[PDB]
Write a protein that binds this ligand. Structure first.
Ligand SMILES: CCCCCCCCCCCCCCCCCC(=O)OC[C@H](CO[C@@H]1O[C@H](CO[C@H]2O[C@H](CO)[C@H](O)[C@H](O)[C@H]2O)[C@H](O)[C@H](O)[C@H]1O)OC(=O)CCCCCCCCCCCCCCCCC
Ligand code: CLA
Ligand code: CLA
Ligand code: CLA
Ligand code: CLA
Ligand code: CLA
Ligand SMILES: CCCCCCCCCCCCCCCCCC(=O)OC[C@H](CO[C@@H]1O[C@H](CO)[C@H](O)[C@H](O)[C@H]1O)OC(=O)CCCCCCCCCCCCCCCCC
Ligand SMILES: CCCCCCCCCCCCCCCC(=O)OC[C@H](COP(=O)(O)OC[C@@H](O)CO)OC(=O)CCCCCCCCCCCCCCC
Ligand SMILES: CC1=C(/C=C/C(C)=C/C=C/C(C)=C/C=C/C=C(C)/C=C/C=C(C)/C=C/C2=C(C)CCCC2(C)C)C(C)(C)CCC1
Ligand SMILES: CC1=C(/C=C/C(C)=C/C=C/C(C)=C/C=C/C=C(C)/C=C/C=C(C)/C=C/C2=C(C)CCCC2(C)C)C(C)(C)CCC1
Ligand SMILES: CC1=C(/C=C/C(C)=C/C=C/C(C)=C/C=C/C=C(C)/C=C/C=C(C)/C=C/C2=C(C)CCCC2(C)C)C(C)(C)CCC1
Ligand SMILES: CCCCCCCS[C@@H]1O[C@H](CO)[C@@H](O)[C@H](O)[C@H]1O
Ligand SMILES: [Ca+2]
Ligand SMILES: [Cl-]
Ligand SMILES: [Cl-]
Ligand SMILES: [Fe+2]
Ligand SMILES: [Mg+2]
Lengths: 34, 63, 36, 32, 172, 501, 38, 40, 342, 31, 79, 34
């Protein structure tokens, strides 16, 4: 199928950038003094 | 620690940690197997390498 | 009851900077070959 | 005679070295 | 040129025009940078080998040194004990000042000679030329590896700046 | 806390979680295999095993499935080109699905083992400390390994209970999966003899069973237990990594040189077949035999199978690629369509001339034609002003025998020269360069990629062996050296590192 | 049949065994003479 | 012929040895220009 | 009462001028034979029958031009054992066939294994961590990939490096012309580690020598150090301040500094080895496809990348007939690529 | 797209130099 | 445990031994070349043994297993 | 220039994945009870 060639990178970053934002915030919350 | 049915069955297989035969035990026999292994590897290498050429052993796609 | 084998993990600031330098410089080196 | 590891080491290198240097010296006088 | 492939262009044309591989100052350069790298790895491994135990298993050993502490952080006697036995006793430094001087001097001198190689090939005093140096009883040329180098250099020579030369000799 | 490069050390003293990590690794590998196969099946064109076989298409797992007897698709085709087959469940798709399901079960098993790490099995009855009896584990695992090796050789490869393995003629024309009998004489050690693979597995399997029984029943000598630190699991990591880099070098080697386990219809021809003109010789043999039986030239060449001609072409040589030229071979020269036929070059005198072929080393190569005695008769000049051997001066023509162009003769010098440029690559093919937007630049086959990855990983695994061996043997000083100046200095001890001297 | 290269192989093996056998006999003999008191 | 060190001063050994080196290496250089390897 | 193995062990590990060890049993003979094989072949042995080359002092070569050359391409990857089927026990014929090449490669490989075992054995005895041995993995990776893996992927040992100064220079130029090896990012990482390592070597030795504490009255400052002193002989604090202000960053941790000195050149050599493993298969970084598509369509488009391939093409055409004599190349004058005039 | 990618990476590296120098972990004598 | 090289090499005993063995080995190596034996042990051509008088093609080995005979044959072709 | 259409996604992920791994680790080190 003749898809937009930027579809892949747009989709990849759309997932990765905010997912990683959340993961960074979750992990440093867990590592805070129990 | 948690016992289980399968764990109980397997117990004997994990019960002799640290146990040894005295001194050198079977080391000498092991040495001989190692030497024979070294010689076997040398033979298969030299056959592949065509350093050892044997009757009825044509090391080729073709016979 | 908790696993006593657990340990905290660390990456100090200098190691972050060293690491990001490694990654960015490797990307700067390899990107040409990726685009080809 | 009593030989040492050091003495053996020294002579495995030194002895051929001199022999080779004599060989190479002689080669400087070969003409085609 | 100020560029990665342009640097390689420079190097290849320089070989064609100066046989720099066969020049002893470039050879000293190589000894300086290979030697620099060998002694870098050497010194690093020797000091790392002999760090004094100051940390637990779950910590980086680097935490056993505090910036500005007075005491040495490794045992140079132990380092020397290892290296002196690796080669023989007197091949090893136990004066850290002599050691660090050598680490400075070896790559620095080598690289001075590399610079002077380029700076003297600049005035066309070029690498050693043993092209057809070996001749048989009749007069036949017996090639050596120098002559094979010379065939590679010719290829670079005849191709470079393919539209720039109108006359038979490349004189600069 | 732990630096990033040590995070996994938390498993060293935790047998249940180590198992969970191993299960997760195993789930990942099996998921990879299932995923890879499904992707290959989504991209593979099964319609031409002659000029568009798997190894032209960048297939990496498909040949491993074919090597052991999975040759069929549920959709009805086989890799040998058959229609109407029923492969049963064990088609390429069934194998993929089975690996995906395995992956999931392993993943669930990993979770269970992670949570229920504190099993009474993992503790020493006497000390209550986590303990694994590694010497006996080694016997158990070796014995299981022996059984499976034996069974694989005696049942699967023989066809006795299983499908056999891939075998072919010496020119890779008629490959298929067949039952293979063990070879018990010295030809069993010939890498190109598939019966030796069968006898290996039977014999090495029986030996693994016997040694595993030994290793189950007999304790290590105190001397070896101490020297090899057999209470330290990292000793096993060290020697297992060594065994694996040995195996990895071996498989890179037999992939590159060829063996009965690296058949050319699955992985492509080897570079040495081009080097030795192996296919050209057999082609010329056949053609000569046809001419001697009375064939015309047209008939002799027309009797050459297209598949045999295609092996005698450099775009199929695995030593003609590039590290960043990615994907299938078809992406470079194109999807091969048809043999054009054998080109015969002749000069104005009618003498037959031969194009000097490109050696694998050369990205480009001049066009030079010599008579049968190696004397140069024509070429394509670079400088023209002093040309003596031009196609135009020498009246060079080309005629084709066999293939698409059978019976045609070209005399227009640009055309004759274009075919001569193709002839440096061996036999001449028509390609579809449009379907994949092919760029004309050669790529390696799965033979090349496999060898590369395995030689590289084997070398890197040498570092891992050295590193873990050292950590095993110097565990006591891993955090640094003792905070006796007479043990490092000279003169004091007679024997190094011994205070009793 | 014992081909020329199999005889060659045996010559190579014997040679290596001799080199190793001599090396170890000599080293064992020397170490037994020249001993570390403790 | 005693085994005692110091009887032939180290400085003389080193001078003579070094002169020996200069000579042998100088002969090698002379050979670069005569006979084999001379290009003539 | 003590067993023979323990008695041999004692004797192997005695503190003597030249430490021996169990490792010595492998190292000494193999290292001696490798070095002695090289000296012997470069002094006395020709390359006429393998290469059509003179390669010994005896034939008139000098230190730069002598080599022990690889065997003929027709030998393939034969071990070329003295007692093997090629030489068949004949020492003279063995030399003429190139048997000293595999002699030296294989003894050199087993000798490198012995040297690294020695590094381990000594470290264990003296009680230091075995980083020096770990660092030596890099020379080993370079030797194995270049002298063994590389020719094993090619047609034969003929294409391995020959052991000699000029022969090695020829190997460099072959890799430029045929492999475009300078374009390879694995080579480039190797370059970075070797030049980076020489950088660290120089800068560290110079920094120590210029931040020394005054620990004596001498103008020559070497005497004012004692191996046993507890105190650092130079100021880490002043050195850190100097480099922070000159270069923007500085080491503050001495242990990290020394580990990094190991890491840099060791990692570089390992990355170069990887690239050579690719070249064994001709898996080169030879080309950039986008460059070639543009240049083919657009005869005014030129970069330093296309300029270098023209040099490579020269190298291959001009060197190949003498460098690969088994090919029997005859390239008529008219087919040789050449620019104008030259 | 390639030019953007190369310039982006380069720009990030320069940004890193700035943080590594001006926002380094400050060296402190344990005192 | 053993004497420093600097003691050994500054002693008369050392020089008495080595004033004879050094020249002896040097002269043995000289003669090894001057009598031509070096050529025959190693199989290195003399200046007059690279080519037979008229030919100009090199005696390259082309057959792995009778390379030994090929060399023997090339050597007979020099009259 | 006719570059490989996957070169952009490859470079982006090559940069992003390991960089994010280091950022996660650094920030959760900073948030640990100091
Ligand atoms: C790190 C740790 C430290 C270790 C350092 C210690 C060093 C130990 C020394 C090891 C020495 C190994 C020598 C291997 C020689 C070899 O391979 O010699 C090669 C031979 C194969 O022989 C070759 O085979 C070729 C292909 O032939 C085949 O195909 C031809 C064309 O069709 C014909 O049909 C022919 O009859 C048929 O046999 C050509 O004939 C060649 O001329 C011939 O040399 O295989 C063989 O002996 C064995 C092949 C399988 C085993 C390979 C294991 C070791 C090598 C791993 C590296 C892989 C290289 C891949 C490159 C990347
Ligand atoms: C009749 C009984 C029988 C028969 C017919 C066979 C037949 C075979 N065996 Mg099996 N074997 C048997 C019994 C048998 N075996 C038994 C009882 C055991 C003991 C458990 C083994 C253990 C064994 C091993 C360990 C190997 C074989 C291999 C082979 C194959 C040799 C052909 C080949 O391709 O080698 C190719 C392999 C070599 C020529 C060996 C190379 C050795 C290298 C050079 C050692 C040095 C390695 C070092 C890491 C290299 C670093 C340097 C390098 C990078 C340059 C062939 C299938 C080999 C195989 O699997 O090949 C695919 C192999 O490695 N066998
Ligand atoms: C053993 C590993 C292996 C091998 C030999 C192959 C082989 C093959 N695959 Mg498969 N593959 C693999 C694993 C492998 N694959 C894995 C794990 C995946 C999931 C990602 C895939 C997914 C995959 C797809 C989606 C496709 C293939 C295709 C192919 C073919 C073309 C390969 C190619 O172009 O490579 C090109 C290789 C490179 C450009 C080399 C990369 C080198 C890296 C980037 C170096 C990095 C250096 C490092 C960062 C340095 C750090 C330094 C530091 C330590 C200091 C070939 C048959 C293609 C095909 O034709 O399918 C039909 C195809 O489309 N493969
Ligand atoms: C079966 C093989 C195997 C196993 C089980 C281990 C396991 C171990 N290693 Mg060893 N090692 C191996 C092979 C292996 N290694 C190899 C081949 C090498 C050379 C490359 C090393 C070199 C090595 C060093 C130098 C060190 C270890 C350390 C460790 C320990 C901590 C690992 C960790 O926390 O990393 C955590 C890793 C990460 C968080 C990220 C790694 C990211 C990598 C660099 C790139 C991504 C890889 C990709 C995801 C997976 C594809 C793999 C496939 C192609 C093989 C652990 C016991 C460490 C140690 O001893 O601790 C005390 C240590 O310092 N290893
Ligand atoms: C640089 C090479 C090198 C070095 C320094 C080491 C170092 C180490 N090894 Mg490893 N190893 C190596 C390569 C090396 N290894 C290779 C190639 C293999 C085969 C895959 C292994 C297999 C191995 C195992 C299985 C184990 C070690 C272990 C060890 C450790 C203890 C010492 C030891 O057992 O040495 C081993 C001795 C050698 C490598 C010397 C081998 C000398 C051979 C016998 C000479 C053969 C000559 C040959 C027949 C000539 C014919 C050639 C032919 C081509 C014609 C130490 C970290 C042990 C460990 O980690 O303990 C905690 C351990 O269990 N090694
Ligand atoms: C540790 C010392 C050591 C090692 C590891 C090597 C290793 C090697 N040598 Mg070197 N060599 C050495 C010391 C060593 N050598 C010394 C001291 C000398 C001078 C005497 C030589 C002189 C020499 C020559 C002249 C040549 C070699 C060659 C070789 C290679 C092939 C060896 C081989 O196939 O052996 C095979 C032998 C073994 C593997 C020994 C096996 C021992 C087993 C375990 C016991 C079997 C005994 C058995 C019961 C009795 C024999 C059976 C009977 C039928 C005869 C290999 C690289 C060859 C080479 O480099 O060619 C390119 C070659 O031509 N070596
Ligand atoms: C006592 C113990 C000593 C142990 C030493 C054993 C280990 C080997 C030593 C290294 C020897 C390698 C150099 C040999 C050179 C030689 O013999 O040339 C011998 C050649 C002979 O000269 C040639 O002879 C021919 C004879 O037909 C022709 O006349 C040629 O024209 C002529 O050039 O001399 C030269 O090439 C000029 C002098 C060259 C010296 C340069 C050496 C640089 C070495 C640096 C790298 C290694 C460092 C070693 C440190 C020690
Ligand atoms: C001459 C230049 C080469 C040696 C030193 C210069 C390198 C500088 C590195 C960076 C600073 C490194 C640095 O800071 O060094 C410092 C180091 C010691 O400092 P000191 O203050 O103790 O001594 C220098 C003066 O103050 C004199 O007492 O300097 C020296 O040791 C100089 C020795 C000169 C010896 C005379 C020259 C001998 C030449 C060496 C052999 C070359 C042979 C070439 C063969 C191919
Ligand atoms: C859960 C479950 C399930 C499901 C499952 C599944 C669905 C799975 C999947 C899985 C998968 C689907 C997986 C995958 C995997 C993959 C992988 C793991 C990959 C990897 C990769 C890598 C590692 C790479 C690397 C690289 C690169 C990237 C580049 C080049 C170089 C190299 C090669 C290195 C079921 C229902 C069954 C049931 C039970 C439960
Ligand atoms: C010791 C030593 C060494 C060695 C050295 C040497 C070997 C030296 C030599 C030296 C010498 C050997 C010197 C000489 C000098 C001389 C002189 C300085 C002279 C002068 C002269 C003159 C001035 C003259 C003049 C004249 C004229 C002008 C004219 C005519 C007359 C006459 C001749 C008089 C070494 C380094 C090893 C080490 C350390 C120590
Ligand atoms: C191969 C072989 C073998 C062995 C052999 C050997 C072991 C030999 C050795 C040899 C040797 C061991 C030789 C040596 C030589 C030496 C020389 C030839 C030297 C020279 C030197 C010089 C000339 C010096 C120079 C210089 C320098 C270096 C720097 C400073 C300055 C001067 C200039 C002084 C055997 C019988 C087992 C068997 C078969 C084969
Ligand atoms: C050098 C090869 C290494 C193999 C190690 C074998 C040493 S085993 C040998 O066995 C005897 C009987 O059990 C003992 O009495 C003796 O002390 C011991 O040296
Ligand atoms: Ca197109
Ligand atoms: Cl240019
Ligand atoms: Cl001009
Ligand atoms: Fe230092
Ligand atoms: Mg001369």
């Amino acid at each position: 199928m003749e898809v937009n060639q930027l579809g892949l990178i747009a989709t990849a970053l759309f997932v990765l950038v905010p997912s990683v934002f959340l993961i960074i915030l979750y992990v440093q919350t867990e590592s805070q003094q129990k | 620690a948690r016992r289980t049915w399968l764990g109980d069955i397997l117990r004997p297989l994990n019960s002799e940690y640290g146990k040894v035969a005295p001194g050198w035990g079977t080391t000498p026999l092991m040495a001989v197997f190692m030497g024979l292994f070294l010689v076997f590897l040398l033979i298969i290498l030299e056959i592949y390498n065509s350093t050892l050429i044997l009757d009825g052993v044509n090391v080729s796609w073709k016979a | 009851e908790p696993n006593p084998n657990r340990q905290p993990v660390e990456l100090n600031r200098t190691s972050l900077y060293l690491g990001l330098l490694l990654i960015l410089v490797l990307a700067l080196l390899f990107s040409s070959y990726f685009f080809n | 005679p009593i030989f040492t590891v050091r003495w053996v080491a020294v002579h495995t290198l030194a002895v051929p070295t001199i022999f080779f240097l004599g060989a190479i010296a002689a080669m400087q006088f070969i003409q085609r | 040129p100020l560029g990665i492939s342009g640097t390689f262009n420079f190097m290849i044309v320089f070989q064609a025009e100066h046989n720099i591989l066969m020049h002893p100052f470039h050879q000293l350069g190589v000894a300086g940078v290979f030697g620099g790298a060998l002694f870098c790895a050497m010194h690093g491994s020797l000091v790392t080998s002999s760090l004094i135990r100051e940390t637990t298993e779950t910590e980086s050993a680097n935490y056993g040194y505090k910036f500005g502490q007075e005491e040495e952080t490794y045992n140079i006697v132990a380092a020397h004990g290892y290296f002196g036995r690796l080669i023989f006793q007197y091949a090893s430094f136990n004066n850290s000042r002599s050691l660090h001087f050598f680490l400075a001097a070896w790559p620095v001198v080598g690289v001075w000679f590399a610079a002077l190689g380029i700076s003297t090939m600049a005035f066309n005093l070029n690498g050693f030329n043993f092209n057809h140096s070996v001749i048989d009883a009749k007069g036949n040329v017996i090639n050596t590896w120098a002559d094979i180098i010379n065939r590679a250099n010719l290829g670079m020579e005849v191709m470079h700046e393919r539209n720039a030369h109108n006359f038979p000799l490349d004189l600069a | 806390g732990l630096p990033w490069y040590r995070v996994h050390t938390v498993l060293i003293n935790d047998p249940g979680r180590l198992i969970a990590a191993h299960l997760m690794h195993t789930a990942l590998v099996a998921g990879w295999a299932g995923s890879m196969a499904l992707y290959e099946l989504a991209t593979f064109d099964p319609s031409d095993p002659v000029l568009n076989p798997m190894w032209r298409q960048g297939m990496f797992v498909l040949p491993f499935m074919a090597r052991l007897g999975v040759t069929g698709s549920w959709s009805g085709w086989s890799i040998t080109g058959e229609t109407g087959i029923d492969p049963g469940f064990w088609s390429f798709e069934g194998v993929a699905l089975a690996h995906i399901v395995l992956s999931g079960l392993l993943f669930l098993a990993a979770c269970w083992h992670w949570v229920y790490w504190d099993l009474e099995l993992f503790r020493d009855p006497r000390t209550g400390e986590p303990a694994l009896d590694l010497p006996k584990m080694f016997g158990i695992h070796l014995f299981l390994a022996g059984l499976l090796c034996f069974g694989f050789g005696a049942f699967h490869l023989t066809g006795l209970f299983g499908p056999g393995m891939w075998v072919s003629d010496p020119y890779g024309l008629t490959g298929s999966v067949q039952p293979v009998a063990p070879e018990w004489g010295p030809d069993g050690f010939n890498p190109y003899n598939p019966g030796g693979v069968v006898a290996h597995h039977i014999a090495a399997g029986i030996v693994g069973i016997i040694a595993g029984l030994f290793h189950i029943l007999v304790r290590p000598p105190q001397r070896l237990y101490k020297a090899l630190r057999m209470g330290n699991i990292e000793t096993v990591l060290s020697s297992s990594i060594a065994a694996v880099f040995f195996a990895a070098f071996v498989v890179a080697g037999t992939m590159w040189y060829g063996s009965a386990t690296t058949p050319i219809e699955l992985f492509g021809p080897t570079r040495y077949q081009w080097d030795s003109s192996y296919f050209q010789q057999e082609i010329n043999r056949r053609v000569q035999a046809s001419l001697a039986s009375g064939a015309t030239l047209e008939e002799a060449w027309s009797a050459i199978p297209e598949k045999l001609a295609f092996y005698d072409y450099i775009g199929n040589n695995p030593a003609k690629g590039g590290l960043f030229r990615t994907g299938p071979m078809n992406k470079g020269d194109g999807i091969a369509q048809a043999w054009k036929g054998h080109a015969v070059f002749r000069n104005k005198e009618g003498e037959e001339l031969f194009v000097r072929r490109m050696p694998a080393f050369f990205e480009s190569f001049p066009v030079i034609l010599t008579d049968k005695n190696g004397v140069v008769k024509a070429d394509i000049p670079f400088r023209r002003a002093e040309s003596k051997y031009s196609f135009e001066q020498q009246g060079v023509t080309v005629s084709f025998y066999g293939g698409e162009l059978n019976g045609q003769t070209f005399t227009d010098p640009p055309t004759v020269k274009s075919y001569a440029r193709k002839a440096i690559f061996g036999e001449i093919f028509e390609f579809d360069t449009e379907t994949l937007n092919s760029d004309g630049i050669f790529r390696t086959s799965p033979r090349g990629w496999f060898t590369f990855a395995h030689a590289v990983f084997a070398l890197l695994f040498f570092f891992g062996h050295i590193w873990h061996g050292a950590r095993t043997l110097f565990r006591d000083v891993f955090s640094g050296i003792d905070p006796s100046p007479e043990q490092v200095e000279w003169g004091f001890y007679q024997k190094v590192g011994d205070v009793t001297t | 049949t014992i081909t020329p290269s199999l005889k060659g192989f045996f010559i190579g093996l014997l040679s290596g065994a001799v080199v190793l056998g001599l090396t170890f006999a000599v080293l064992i003999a020397i170490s037994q003479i020249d001993k570390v008191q403790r | 012929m005693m085994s005692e060190g110091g009887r032939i001063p180290l400085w003389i050994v080193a001078t003579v040895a070094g002169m020996g080196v200069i000579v042998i290496v100088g002969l090698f250089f002379y050979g670069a220009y005569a006979g084999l390897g001379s290009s003539l | 009462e003590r067993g023979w193995f323990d008695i041999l062990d004692d004797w192997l590990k005695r503190d003597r001028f030249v430490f021996v060890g169990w490792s010595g049993i492998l190292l000494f003979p193999c290292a001696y034979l490798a070095l002695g094989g090289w000296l012997t072949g470069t002094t006395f042995v020709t390359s006429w029958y393998t290469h059509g080359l003179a390669s010994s002092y005896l034939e008139g070569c000098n230190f730069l031009t002598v080599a022990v050359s690889t065997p003929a391409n027709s030998m393939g990857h034969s071990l070329l054992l003295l007692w093997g089927p090629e030489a068949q026990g004949d020492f003279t014929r063995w030399c003429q066939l190139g048997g000293l090449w595999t002699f030296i490669a294989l003894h050199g490989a087993f000798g490198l294994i012995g040297f690294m075992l020695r590094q381990f054995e000594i470290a264990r005895l003296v009680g230091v961590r075995p980083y020096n041995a770990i660092a030596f993995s890099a020379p080993i990776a370079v030797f194995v990939s270049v002298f063994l893996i590389y020719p094993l992927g090619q047609s034969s040992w003929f294409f391995a490096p020959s052991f000699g100064v000029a022969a090695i220079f020829r190997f460099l130029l072959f890799f430029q012309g045929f492999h475009n090896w300078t374009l390879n990012p694995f080579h480039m990482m190797g370059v970075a580690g070797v030049l980076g390592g020489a950088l660290l070597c120089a800068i560290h030795g110079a920094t120590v020598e210029n931040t020394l504490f005054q620990d004596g009255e001498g103008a020559s400052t070497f005497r004012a150090f004692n191996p046993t002193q507890a105190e650092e002989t130079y100021s880490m604090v002043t050195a850190n301040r100097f480099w922070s202000q000159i270069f923007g960053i500085a080491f503050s941790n001495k242990r990290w500094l020394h580990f990094f000195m190991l890491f840099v050149p060791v990692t570089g050599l390992w990355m170069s080895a990887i690239g050579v493993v690719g070249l064994a298969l001709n898996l080169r970084s030879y080309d950039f496809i986008s460059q070639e598509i543009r240049a083919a369509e657009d005869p005014e488009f030129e970069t330093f990348y296309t300029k270098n391939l023209l040099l490579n093409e020269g190298i291959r055409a001009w060197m190949a007939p003498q460098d690969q004599p088994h090919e029997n190349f005859v390239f008529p004058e008219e087919v040789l690529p050449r620019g104008n005039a030259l | 797209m390639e030019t953007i990618t190369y310039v982006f990476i380069f720009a990030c590296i320069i940004a890193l130099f700035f943080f590594a120098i001006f926002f380094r972990e400050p060296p402190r004598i344990t005192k | 445990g053993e004497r420093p090289f600097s003691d050994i090499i500054t002693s008369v005993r050392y020089w008495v031994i080595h004033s004879i063995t050094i020249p002896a080995l040097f002269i043995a190596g000289w003669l090894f070349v001057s009598t031509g034996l070096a050529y025959d042990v190693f199989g290195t051509p003399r200046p007059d043994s690279y080519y037979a008088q008229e030919q100009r093609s090199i005696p390259l080995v082309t057959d792995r297993f009778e390379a030994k005979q090929q060399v023997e044959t090339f050597l007979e072709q020099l009259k």
